[PDB]
Amino acid sequence: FTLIELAIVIVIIGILVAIAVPRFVDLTDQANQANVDATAAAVRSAYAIATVQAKG
Amino acid sequence: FTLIELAIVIVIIGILVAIAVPRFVDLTDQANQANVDATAAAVRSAYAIATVQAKG
Known about the structure:
Shape of chain A: rod-shaped
Largest interface: A-B, 13 and 11 residues
Number of helices of chain A: 2
Largest sheet of chain A: none
Oligomer: part of a larger assembly
């Protein structure tokens, strides 16, 4: 590579770095809560259906 | 699904849970009492009709 091409590369690397980038976040607490809540809704419906099947 | 749609779902699940829901209740005692009472009325009438049939 010519020295000019390396100079251009040295410039552009410095500009394509110094972007923002997202953090990874452990969102499993929020997702676990929604899983527990959705499951609780399912248990209530499953119970209601069971009261008809059981006739009691 | 996009992360936005999952975020919206995580919100709405938490709100459609945390309703009230009725308990099932064993009301068979109250219903059994009414059955016994209605049957007792029927036995009295059946007896009265029988006193005419029997002529005694």
